[PDB]
Ligand binder design. Structure first.
Ligand SMILES: Nc1nc2c(ncn2[C@@H]2O[C@H](COP(=O)(O)OP(=O)(O)NP(=O)(O)O)[C@@H](O)[C@H]2O)c(=O)[nH]1
Ligand SMILES: [Ca+2]
Ligand SMILES: [Ca+2]
Ligand SMILES: [Ca+2]
Ligand SMILES: [Ca+2]
Ligand SMILES: [Mg+2]
Lengths: 163, 30, 31
């Protein structure tokens, strides 16, 4: 079965880094003349084909982007734990998803990325509270150390399956 | 940045791979 | 269910969008 996953979030929060880690298993830069956005995985004893839309962070109006996002069945909403604006942007991203899907019931996971960092401005309890208020899972991740990365995408698949 | 065409003899899985690439590319250049 | 053709060098972004949409349709159909 096919799963279309869309990664959204403010500029620089780690959308591309998370996707690259999920698919290619590395953080440091590599040079080899094409990137893959598809992965075959087993989740809860059943095989999945995952396609990932790693959205550009810079936002604008676009009917085409709306259609690309509308194609997604589930969404990772990503902020960085050292970026309070990216956290406060999450409400906007959820509203955006609900607009494009024309629904209040869209599979979603809240992701707090960069938990490897030496300092933090967004505390865990804030994010757990917000996710709970949305009725969605919350997962802290690090694209650098790979901590939680599999868990974030796999939990999103679990949410889609329950839809 | 635009993905290369999949190839005339591309398998269904090859097309799936290309499609995911194009999905990302189109979003990026809007 | 006809397989769409990938447009060439001269393709506009809208041409690529059309191919994206037709390919989504085809790949859905043969599944
Ligand atoms: N320490 C640390 N740095 C990270 C992590 N994830 C991403 N970064 C770094 O933060 C920067 C932004 O990463 P990037 O993947 O480009 O984020 P993005 O959300 O795709 N950016 P954009 O919105 O511009 O597309 C890069 O320098 C990257 O190395 C993480 O988990 N830990
Ligand atoms: Ca690799
Ligand atoms: Ca525009
Ligand atoms: Ca403030
Ligand atoms: Ca633009
Ligand atoms: Mg990026």
């Amino acid at each position: 079965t096919e799963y279309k996953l869309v990664v959204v979030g403010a500029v620089g929060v780690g959308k591309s880094a998370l996707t690259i880690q999920l698919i290619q298993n590395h953080f440091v830069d590599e040079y080899d003349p094409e990137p893959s956005y598809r992965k075959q995985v087993v989740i809860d004893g059943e095989t999945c084909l995952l396609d990932i839309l790693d959205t550009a962070g810079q936002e604008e109006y676009s009917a085409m982007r709306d259609q690309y996002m509308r194609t997604g069945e589930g969404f990772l909403c990503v902020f960085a734990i050292n970026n309070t604006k990216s956290f406060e942007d999450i409400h906007h991203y959820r509203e955006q998803i609900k607009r494009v899907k024309d629904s209040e019931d869209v599979p979603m996971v809240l992701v707090g990325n960069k938990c490897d960092l030496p300092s933090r401005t967004v505390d865990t309890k804030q994010a757990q509270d917000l996710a709970r208020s949305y009725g969605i899972p919350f997962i802290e991740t690090s694209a650098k150390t790979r901590q939680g990365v599999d868990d974030a995408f796999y939990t999103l698949v679990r949410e889609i399956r329950k839809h | 940045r635009r993905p290369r065409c999949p190839g005339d003899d591309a398998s269904i899985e090859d097309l799936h791979e290309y499609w995911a690439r194009l999905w990302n590319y189109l979003y990026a250049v809007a």
